[PDB]
Design a protein around this ligand. Sequence first.
Ligand SMILES: O=C(Cn1c2c(c(-c3cccc(Cl)c3)cc1=O)C(=O)N=C2)Nc1ccc(-c2nnn[nH]2)cc1
Length: 236
Amino acid sequence: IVGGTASVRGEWPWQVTLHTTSPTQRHLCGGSIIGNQWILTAAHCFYGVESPKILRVYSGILNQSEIKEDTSFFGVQEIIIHDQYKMAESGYDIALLKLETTVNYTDSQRPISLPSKGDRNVIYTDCWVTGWGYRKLRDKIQNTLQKAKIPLVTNEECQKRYRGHKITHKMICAGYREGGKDACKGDSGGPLSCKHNEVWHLVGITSWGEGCAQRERPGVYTNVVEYVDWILEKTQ
Ligand SMILES: O=C(Cn1c2c(c(-c3cccc(Cl)c3)cc1=O)C(=O)N=C2)Nc1ccc(-c2nnn[nH]2)cc1
């Protein structure tokens, strides 16, 4: 996260850190708890992942440095990538992780609601991106989970900034005209969380952008409301 600030313990309890353990253990991507056995994340996180056997899902993490050889994690039973996914910039950047057991929900590990039936025309004004990603284009994974408030942009404005890409109704964009706050490398798969009537909804999945926090280059997110039918089909 560029231009963000440290989170506190318990602040974003649907946020997970997805680790690979091949060839060494590291943070790969963010993800969001959407059900007791379900993480919603980005398909592009699994490029070069040989199988779910090497993945670990950690919940209730504030600092990456909390994770030690005895820290409990959820195994991943299945990675469900959207069957039309080809590359982040061409859309369908969405994946479900089915966990090997159920999360018992606590103060540290809670689900986020999908965007709700009847809210397709809500204008979200309170949207936050979170993650352990770089704070600039050439940086490192951050220890402490970062947060940044970012305004949604119209698909029309977003398409005008990305004339070499197809910005579709299945994407949502967010950023400041003068840049400075954005997702960056290692935030992919994490949430764009929007609060409406004091309820959080998982509006976006961090997907791609041109650099990080550049002027007139908003971040591009998977538009979760356009995948609710796909999520319910896969999870039922
Ligand atoms: O960069 C990635 C994958 N990614 C991308 C992009 C973005 C991205 C950039 C700007 C806005 C938005 Cl909404 C997304 C995030 C993002 O996470 C991108 O535009 N193109 C790729 N993953 C990643 C993980 C980990 C290390 C890493 N590990 N150790 N050191 N670095 C290094 C990169």
